[model samples]
Target: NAADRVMQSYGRCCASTGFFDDFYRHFLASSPQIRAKFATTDMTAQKHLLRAGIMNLVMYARGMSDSKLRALGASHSRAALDIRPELYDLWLDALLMAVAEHDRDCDAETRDAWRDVMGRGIAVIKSYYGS
Candidate 1:
């Protein structure tokens, strides 16, 4: 349910940010289950959480301390929530979609910089979750 919420929030944010078309294309490609999940939830709240989660991830990727990241990961794990690799794959796809939509303003260097940041974030998440 949380995962579905996350996905919907992501979709809403992407849409609002003018990346909806690209986001939906990639989102659907990554997981039909997530798309189906979207159809079943209260999209508004889900979008809020998705935005928060994405912001948190970006913050964490930028410079959040390892201890904090670990704590976050542990908390999620304690809930019996496993961060499947496919989730990360889907997340990456969604991010790429957003980037593609916004790249006209980002430039090549900025895009690469963001990619590194995201890659590190994914590594941290996967490492803590035992991927």
Candidate 2:
């Protein structure tokens, strides 16, 4: 589907080449509370973590199983980084901003496709918080 095509543009760019490093760099600056959480972040490790997340996210767009989705949530549980369920919005927004900046053809269709991936994964990640 065209959706996969759009999502892939962003995913492929983020696979390396430090594109999202700028995304995360700006993300950290967006909110003081978020900034606080990433204070000691290892930039290299952080990029990979984000890369992994994006991979998992796009997989969901292709119907990744619920069990794997649950694992996704588990990774960000309070036990993981304490990704307070509430912050997912800001997280998604930063990603939207990042997509717009990095993708040359980031039209509404592409933006919505990316949001679809985030919404699906974010729902699973948040489900773990209440579990």
Candidate 3:
């Protein structure tokens, strides 16, 4: 039910040309620590990575199998990319900021839907930290 709303809004958000770009821009500016992590990143490739990450996030939110999301989490875990847990909060905030700008018909309900669904994916991602 919530995922349905989030998916619709996400589709609309993606329809706009620079949704992902705006997200990355906002995310990188959110924190110096975050910005430093991507110092040598290839943003072109990173954009596609965001696409896959968000796509898998939605799939995980839909109550599907966890296999794909697990792989994503594992890569972001402490042993791998070491994406810190607190940074996921920044990620969600930037994502919602992008959604607000791009999801033209977005309402408070839609905003909450994104948070609820994305929170689930974030929780799973955070769980991989010690694993």
Best by TM-score: 3
Superior candidate under lDDT, 2 versus 3:
3
Sort all candidates by lDDT, best to worst: 3, 2, 1
TM-score per prediction, in order, is 0.62, 0.85, 0.96
| CA lDDT of each prediction against the hidden true structure | 0.58, 0.76, 0.92
Best by lDDT: 3
Q: Point out the higher-scoring one by lDDT: 1 or 3.
A: 3
Clashes of each: 1, 0, 0
* Tens digit per residue, CA lDDT, model 3, 67-91: 9878878999999999989999999
Cα displacement (Å) at residue 96, model 1? 1.4
Cα deviation of 3, candidate 2, in Å: 4.1
How much is the lDDT of residue 85 in candidate 2?
83
Clashing pairs in 2: none
